[PDB]
Amino acid sequence: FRIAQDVVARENDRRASALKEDYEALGANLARRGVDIEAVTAKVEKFFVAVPSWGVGTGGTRFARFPGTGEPRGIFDKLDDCAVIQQLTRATPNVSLHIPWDKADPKELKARGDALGLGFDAMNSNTFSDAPGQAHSYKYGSLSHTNAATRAQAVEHNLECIEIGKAIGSKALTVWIGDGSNFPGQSNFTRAFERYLSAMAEIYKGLPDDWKLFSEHKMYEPAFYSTVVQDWGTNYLIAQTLGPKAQCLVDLGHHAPNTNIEMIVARLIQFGKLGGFHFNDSKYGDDDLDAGAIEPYRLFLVFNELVDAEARGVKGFHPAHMINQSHNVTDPIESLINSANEIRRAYAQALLVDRAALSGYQEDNDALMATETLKRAYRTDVEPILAEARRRTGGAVDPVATYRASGYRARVAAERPASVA
Amino acid sequence: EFRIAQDVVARENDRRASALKEDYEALGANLARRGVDIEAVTAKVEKFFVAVPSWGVGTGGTRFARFPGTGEPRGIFDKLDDCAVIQQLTRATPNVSLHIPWDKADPKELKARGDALGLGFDAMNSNTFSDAPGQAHSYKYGSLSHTNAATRAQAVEHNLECIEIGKAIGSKALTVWIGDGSNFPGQSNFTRAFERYLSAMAEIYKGLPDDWKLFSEHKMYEPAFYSTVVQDWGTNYLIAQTLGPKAQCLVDLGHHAPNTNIEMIVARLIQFGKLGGFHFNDSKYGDDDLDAGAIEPYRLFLVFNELVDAEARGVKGFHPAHMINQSHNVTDPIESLINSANEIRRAYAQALLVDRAALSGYQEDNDALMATETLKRAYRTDVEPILAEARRRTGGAVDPVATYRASGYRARVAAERPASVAGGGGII
Amino acid sequence: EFRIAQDVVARENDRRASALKEDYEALGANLARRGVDIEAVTAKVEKFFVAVPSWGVGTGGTRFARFPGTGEPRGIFDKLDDCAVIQQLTRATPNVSLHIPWDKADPKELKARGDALGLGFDAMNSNTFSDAPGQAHSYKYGSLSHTNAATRAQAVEHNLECIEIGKAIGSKALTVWIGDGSNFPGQSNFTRAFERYLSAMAEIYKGLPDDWKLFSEHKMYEPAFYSTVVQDWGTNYLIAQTLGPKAQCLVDLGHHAPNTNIEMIVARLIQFGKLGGFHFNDSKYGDDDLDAGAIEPYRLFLVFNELVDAEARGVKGFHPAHMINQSHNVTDPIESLINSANEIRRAYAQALLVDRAALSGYQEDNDALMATETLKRAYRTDVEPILAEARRRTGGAVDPVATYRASGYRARVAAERPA
Amino acid sequence: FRIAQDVVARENDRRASALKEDYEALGANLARRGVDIEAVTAKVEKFFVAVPSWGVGTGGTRFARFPGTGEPRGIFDKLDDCAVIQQLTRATPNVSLHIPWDKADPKELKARGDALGLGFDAMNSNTFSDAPGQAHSYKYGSLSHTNAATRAQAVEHNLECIEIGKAIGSKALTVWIGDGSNFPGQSNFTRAFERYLSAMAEIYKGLPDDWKLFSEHKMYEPAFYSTVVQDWGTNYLIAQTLGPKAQCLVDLGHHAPNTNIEMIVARLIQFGKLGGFHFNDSKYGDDDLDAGAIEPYRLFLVFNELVDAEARGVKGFHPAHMINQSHNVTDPIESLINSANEIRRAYAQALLVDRAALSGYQEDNDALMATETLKRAYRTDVEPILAEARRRTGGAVDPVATYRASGYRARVAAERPASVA
Ligand SMILES: OC[C@H]1O[C@@](O)(CO)[C@H](O)[C@@H]1O
Ligand SMILES: OC[C@H]1O[C@@](O)(CO)[C@H](O)[C@@H]1O
Ligand SMILES: OC[C@H]1O[C@@](O)(CO)[C@H](O)[C@@H]1O
Ligand SMILES: OC[C@H]1O[C@@](O)(CO)[C@H](O)[C@@H]1O
Ligand SMILES: [Mn+2]
Ligand SMILES: [Mn+2]
Ligand SMILES: [Mn+2]
Ligand SMILES: [Mn+2]
Ligand SMILES: [Mn+2]
Ligand SMILES: [Mn+2]
Ligand SMILES: [Mn+2]
Ligand SMILES: [Mn+2]
């Protein structure tokens, strides 16, 4: 146990009275609205989102990085920290790895995961940066590089990621690359995309029968003029071209200003290509902020599309969910905790939507009542539900308060040496 | 017929002939030093055409107000007469695009007037984003994707009627742009609305002749301010792919999100054979509908760079339907359309100057600087002499607007047509 | 008088009274646990008012079309009658904002009708962004900043006329929003046009009563699509500062560039004493004019957070004018305004819940996570019971739209008014 | 000379004939337009823009940095490369320094500058990153940090930058900080700004009589929710509050999408607070791409406002122009060369605008002809003017071509050790 059980119990007891009052009050209010709070709590306690191994360390920008104390020294320390997030929130049982950052003996990774009670989600390849001993640089691209040998090298890297994933329990590979151009004319849009498609086809051939390949679009950064996989339109063409095992990953902060992201989600679901999500929040660009910290309603609206899919009876719909954020000015563990909480919060509210009433208002084109129907769900403070779900599953009623009460950060700060060079 | 007296055209051409010859010869020499035959460029420019919107020769407005000018066209016939001026002077707009019901009239007459004016008819445009007098079902909450079956049927019928009018006048395509969408979260179920849209478009597709095309046009927002069914090229692609070989996508420059790389969308659609055509205009904030190239000329060039790259790589079966789609709120509509058509040919001509072999080399070598400089060498070239010479050699005007103003046309039609009144927009 | 039958209000209130009592008491206990007196919050909420736009009572439209509903108001008097319903049910919109010349009519009759309906009048709104019948000079190329002196003079005169009408009905402010700008580079000389605008506004300020305020409203674009004279808050501040103590800036939520941090603009103006007022609405793309809070409710809360913080910091003489400015294109204008007024009070109420002492501590300690969580604890709170009780206690409806629909008001006016 | 004189002469003679033809042809066309090409050329050869010392090194993003060969390390290597840009373009005689990056003995710096034929422009302070041994971290801010000691440290740093500048010939201090927040509530907008103003007042007090203090606004990055100096409105408030010696710096890529930047320039000029403009281009965010490579007309429109003011000589109008870009996929020197070229190109074209005709069309509200009057100047290919100006002043007809013919990059590659072969 990363966090002492007596600490969790103590903090849970300190807040048990208040939780009871709020939960029972919300329960009665929901009952009057025709909703069974127990049914919602039962679903909420089973909603999981993967935690990025690279998210437990402090992030930075191209201008600077300001590390905190006890930064994880490697993947094993990172898994130890991810275990804290899972123990306290019980919403992050799985971790997403990034290769080569997390490269290590698969048997050891697996052993450590099992020991901490953590599993592994989709693998993430890295051909947007150069690793030591690389025969070819990814400066001008990787999977879509003009140089055949460079693409070949990138393909082999992704295949290696699949080999690592198979050994630790992963069932998917997420591919995000920086490929694109910074100047008009630098790249031939079509030829670069064709090159990408050919390389991804090779990677697709390396997929086990029960695996999935997720391509992730991004409007810009690191490429500032054009990006090969720039939006969901190109992403759909990729997935449709590759095959049944290929789907699209939607990262909230990767879209043009004012984009209606929830519609993109609906469109991908309709055509069965919604592979998964990368949750985070933003205001300007790919800010990678704590999910829901900026626009909680938008997050709720994305979940509204996910829940509606269930209501509509969409088959075989199991999108992969992962948090993909950068924590530059907070304790990474605390931000991941509250971010996981916001995601469950939006999910819970989406479950409260009176779909029967909504379908009626949609058919009668009663726009005002249709939107108010969504608002009645979103406006509901579901914190008591999230807290109870945690209490029942061995988590903390107030995760961050319990984390702080445990003195974990100070503990690891004394155990881990900060990098000097 | 000649809306503009030939003597005025000749007079104004001779007046600038000397200067033109000097500039054309200078550019010709420079291009020769660059291994380019100015004549080959001029020859292609003379043959580049862009359709003019019948509704573009009238003064436009916003939801706040409309400030009509003098001699506003009363209907399609006055509009065709004004369009004839644009074609006569620029020689770049031989075809007009009709919008129904605005331009509803006897097909025979339209065709007859067009032939007399030397104008053809491009893509037909349907209108289910507004209600017409005596209309049975309102399009307030949608049309082709409306929840009410009867409303969708009515919209479908309207589009089929547009195809019937087009066949009678020589058109070979239908362009479908609707305002369908929602202003509030929850108001519409994104998927169901799209399913309804797809089903209705399928019915319209069934009414297409074997040599016709059906163009769906995406738009991020307006009139819908929360979600729009056909919101972007992604949804538009799904539409074209689902409907069939005769269905393609139309790209309107000002219908994209801020900072969108529009030239890439063009390339992607060309790659998958779904680039039906373009709707030219410029913008800075939203769907501003400004004069093409008046705000970002380089972007217009970059879009044409993609068009010429395909046109040069022998991309078979590549005949995108180009059209100007603008709103002229503070200029004489005819003058704006004239210079807009000019800017479009300008971007086209400059795209033709690009050393494709050199560019390809720099792309393969990842020489980003030289690759971008290769495009700039073409873009920086002032091709106005080629544009002016092309017009002169084809019966047009060296300086179209100067000739237009010298003719006194606006004053003339102003005397022939009834006066208009300014007013507010649909805001209230 | 009462637009909505008093028996319908009592009926629809009694129908929901039991549930409200349960929700209000539960919220009261929760807030009590948080050291907050729910009664204190409700008291402030029932005192929060926002003006309703006369031009928002009718169905709005776009440059593509207008789809009116039934019983559309024929003029300002019908609009006042409809505004009376909004106030009767929400009790949050006692004042109406007029727009001249759209609402031109005998000022004396307007006041009389207002007094009879229990409505007051907020800031007057001038209109030199469209031409009126018989107008000598067109505003096509601008108004207060038009190159033609006679046109600027005419625009100034119109604004003074707006002040005359306002003085007769009890208005104490003039809001000036114009479309002046250019659609093409070179069309206007940015600086000279602004110099002309400043000179014309100086004339208006000269004729401004000493018990009145003058609000200039910035907008990034529309109707001008290349440049706009009063394009942002920076230019707006220069205007207010140049004109004088009685001149301030009006912030319309949908008038800023994509991704702009609007709440910061609000803070900056307060700090320099130039925040005159707000035009509330919501949006996603441009100046969409949608129901307030319908798209981004947190942003609305964050704007009010700055307003409540101004009081907490001890800023003096801060009494911003609040006004709804929306276009209802696909809903019953009355229902949208009702729920919009409600959303504004909702954001206000939540801002009142922020533990200022705790927040200040987290800010001083740079505890970003707890600071944001402190705002969230307030924002996540469902204050609907407070809003409903406030309405109930002041003669309004527990559920405004439900009571409105039960009254059959729309069908009624649909029969009294043309098609 | 960094570049051999014989190479410059050789590459000039190779292009002299064609240049003669083009220059004469343009001179004739301009003559028919009532314009004297010589008057334009004389002004162009005198238009200078400062080159950033940090611009000659290869740039990167938060994801990766792909260095090229012969990367300059330290201010001395950088000055050596900056000299190349000045010798070939003759448009960048002054270099802008950044402290503590370019820290060195002032006398030695001044000596190296004089030897290379380079002067020194505005000094640039750095409190957006932590230097080793630093007593207080700038993680949560600098000049506006809540901690008094931290603000004092940032103030002292800025004063030290002025001291360094006074010793090498600089006459201004540019202050751009990352200060802001990533979460609502994290900062109190007003108190943070009050702290900033108070700290800047302390810096202002240390300014010599002939020095200027430039504050730079930026919408976002590194702060992703709010930034203290977020736009020109706040920037104007700062300059007006501080005093006559304080002005605002406008960086093209630091504005919200669709912003009309040329108007901001005009407004600042009208109120005498336009301190300078930092050139670069962009399409998405603060891309820091080569000036005019994405939107050359916008660059021309900015210069239209500058030239209109330069013609009349407005009070307080004496801009301190600098290039501020990041070269992630090109030879930094080549990009800086062509960027300086684009800046002079836009300046030259603005010089061609018929102000009298323009003024007329503006007064008559003839929008079409007004915009056409600007286009007639913009559509003019002034390359012959830029090339001749360089030829007459000791520069190269075709800078990049001459640069590549000299083999300079290969030369420094052999003198400077890369991290890896
Ligand atoms: O942290 C880098 C990750 O961020 C991205 O979203 C790119 O910004 C990709 O998913 C990468 O894996
Ligand atoms: O005038 C409306 C036209 O504008 C559009 O671009 C919609 O904005 C469509 O093409 C319509 O046909
Ligand atoms: O309805 C027009 C109003 O909208 C505006 O916000 C302009 O868009 C102004 O405030 C006007 O008064
Ligand atoms: O390289 C960092 C420079 O970039 C900036 O524009 C910040 O983006 C500032 O001017 C800094 O000096
Ligand atoms: Mn991602
Ligand atoms: Mn990302
Ligand atoms: Mn269009
Ligand atoms: Mn359009
Ligand atoms: Mn407004
Ligand atoms: Mn508005
Ligand atoms: Mn800068
Ligand atoms: Mn910058």
Which of D126, D161, D324, D328 for a ligand 4 pocket mutation test, highest count of atoms within 8 Å of Cβ?
A: D324
Surrounding ion ligand 6 within 5 Å at CB are: A 286
Would you say D197 and D213 are in contact if contact means Cβ atoms under 8 Å apart? Answer: no
Measuring from atom 10 of ligand 2, which residue has the nearest CA? B177
Question: What tokens were used for A185?
Answer: 């004319």
Cross-chain CB nearest to D186 (options C237, C298, C363):
C363
| C286 interfacial to chain D (CB closer than 8 Å) | no
**Pick from A194, A180, B356, B260: which is nearest to D329 by CA?**
A180
Ligand closest to the CA atom of residue D64: 1
Q: How many B×D Cβ pairs under 8 Å?
A: 72
Nearest CA in chain A to C333: A368
Measuring from atom 10 of ligand 1, which residue has the nearest CA? A176
Would you say D183 and C374 are in contact if contact means Cβ atoms under 8 Å apart? Answer: no
CA–centroid distance, B302 to ligand 8, in Å, is: 20
Extended beta strands in B118-268, E state? 120-121, 124-125, 173-176, 181-182, 213-217, 227-228, 247-252
Neighbours of chain B (3+ CB pairs under 8 A): A, C, D
D-proximal residues of C, 111-170, CB under 8 Å = 141, 147
CA angle C166, C168, C173 (to 5 degrees): 25
What Rg value do the Cα atoms of chain B yield, rounded? 22
CA–centroid distance, B255 to ligand 8, in Å, is: 6
Measured torsion, CA atoms of residues B245, B250, B255, B261, in degrees rounded to the nearest 10: 80
Closest ligand 2 atom to residue B250 Cα is 10
Distances (CA, A) of C110 to C54, C100, C103: 12, 13, 9
Would you say A52 and A323 are in contact if contact means Cβ atoms under 8 Å apart? Answer: yes
Position C336: which residue type? S
Measured torsion, CA atoms of residues C277, C280, C284, C286, in degrees rounded to the nearest 10: -60
Domain, as residue range, for B66: 1-428
Residues of D in contact with C182 (CB under 8 A): 367
Which region, left, alpha or beta, applies to residue B168 given φ > 0 means left and ψ of -120 to 50 means alpha?
Answer: alpha
Question: What tokens were used for A349?
Answer: 């509210």
Closest ligand 4 atom to residue D286 Cα is 8
Q: Do B295 and D297 touch (CB under 8 A)?
A: yes
Q: Do D63 and A138 touch (CB under 8 A)?
A: no
Nearest CA in chain A to C405: A369
Domain CATH for A159 = 3.20.20.150
Q: Do C286 and B286 touch (CB under 8 A)?
A: yes
- C-alpha A71/C-alpha B385 separation (Å) is 66
- C-alpha D405/C-alpha D396 separation (Å) is 11
- Would you give the DSSP letter of residue A98? B
Neighbours of chain C (3+ CB pairs under 8 A): A, B, D
Sole residue written with tokens 């329960």: A27
CA dihedral (B22, B25, B27, B29) positive or negative = negative
Measuring from atom 11 of ligand 2, which residue has the nearest CA? B177
Which region, left, alpha or beta, applies to residue A304 given φ > 0 means left and ψ of -120 to 50 means alpha?
Answer: alpha
- C-alpha A275/C-alpha A244 separation (Å) is 11
Q: Where are the alpha helices (DSSP H) in A117-147?
A: none
Widest CA span in chain B: 66
Per-residue buried b or exposed e for D12-50, using 16+ beta carbons within 10 Å of the residue's own CB: beebeebbeebbebbbebbeeeebebeebbebbbebbbb
Would you say B344 and B364 are in contact if contact means Cβ atoms under 8 Å apart? Answer: no
| C330 interfacial to chain A (CB closer than 8 Å) | yes
Ligand closest to the CA atom of residue D127: 4
| Beta strand C227-228 pairing with C181-182 | antiparallel
Distance between A258 CA and the closest CA of chain C, angstroms: 6
- C-alpha B185/C-alpha A378 separation (Å) is 12
Coil, helix or strand at residue C144: coil
Cross-chain CB nearest to A374 (options B186, B232, B260):
B186
Which of D95, D101, D176 for a ligand 4 pocket mutation test, highest count of atoms within 8 Å of Cβ?
A: D176
CA angle B277, B282, B287 (to 5 degrees): 85
CA–centroid distance, A264 to ligand 11, in Å, is: 35
Q: Is D404 exposed, middle or buried (0-12, 13-18, 19+ CB in 10 A)?
A: middle
Residues of D in contact with A186 (CB under 8 A): 329
Which of A97, A123, A278, A288 for a ligand 1 pocket mutation test, highest count of atoms within 8 Å of Cβ?
A: A278
Measuring from atom 3 of ligand 2, which residue has the nearest CA? B325
Q: Do D329 and A139 touch (CB under 8 A)?
A: yes
**Pick from A228, A227, A219, A214: which is nearest to A252 by CA?**
A219
Distance between A324 CA and the closest CA of chain D, angstroms: 14
CA dihedral (B36, B40, B43, B44) positive or negative = negative
Residues of C in contact with A287 (CB under 8 A): none
Measuring from atom 9 of ligand 2, which residue has the nearest CA? B177
Distance between D12 CA and the closest CA of chain A, angstroms: 27
Question: What angle, rounded to 10 degrees, do the helices at B262-271 and B233-243 form?
Answer: 20
Distances (CA, A) of C288 to A351, B227, C261, C335, D173: 29, 12, 17, 18, 43
The H or E element spanning position A212 is: strand A212-216
Distance between B404 CA and the closest CA of chain D, angstroms: 13
Question: How many domains does the structure of chain A reveal?
Answer: 1
| A36 interfacial to chain C (CB closer than 8 Å) | no
| D182 interfacial to chain A (CB closer than 8 Å) | yes
Question: What tokens were used for B3?
Answer: 């809306």
Would you say B291 and B280 are in contact if contact means Cβ atoms under 8 Å apart? Answer: no
Residue C316, number of CB atoms within 10 A of its CB: 7
- C-alpha C291/C-alpha C254 separation (Å) is 11
Coil, helix or strand at residue A109: helix
Residue B413, number of CB atoms within 10 A of its CB: 19
- C-alpha A77/C-alpha A412 separation (Å) is 9
Q: Concatenated DSSP letters for D5-61?
A: HHHHHHHHHHHHHHHHHHHHHHHHHHHHTT--HHHHHHHHTT---BEEGGGSSPPB-
Ligand closest to the CA atom of residue A253: 6
Residue D311, number of CB atoms within 10 A of its CB: 12
Question: What tokens were used for D21?
Answer: 């033809």
Would you say D84 and D2 are in contact if contact means Cβ atoms under 8 Å apart? Answer: yes
- C-alpha B291/C-alpha A8 separation (Å) is 66
Distance between A22 CA and the closest CA of chain C, angstroms: 7
Would you say D254 and D216 are in contact if contact means Cβ atoms under 8 Å apart? Answer: yes
| B36 interfacial to chain D (CB closer than 8 Å) | no
Q: Is B217 in the pocket of ligand 2 (CB under 6 A)?
A: yes
The 3 state secondary structure assigned to C337-406 is HHHHHHHHHHHHHHHHHCCHHHHHHHHHCCCHHHHHHHHHHHHCCCCHHHHHHHHHHCCCCCCHHHHHHH
Q: Is C419 exposed, middle or buried (0-12, 13-18, 19+ CB in 10 A)?
A: exposed
- C-alpha D72/C-alpha D417 separation (Å) is 10
Question: What tokens were used for A96?
Answer: 């997403």
Return the half-sphere exposure (C-beta side, CA atoms, 13 A cut-off) of residue B378. Answer: 30
Sole residue written with tokens 């336009």: D274
Distance between D219 CA and the closest CA of chain C, angstroms: 8
Sole residue written with tokens 């049944």: A244
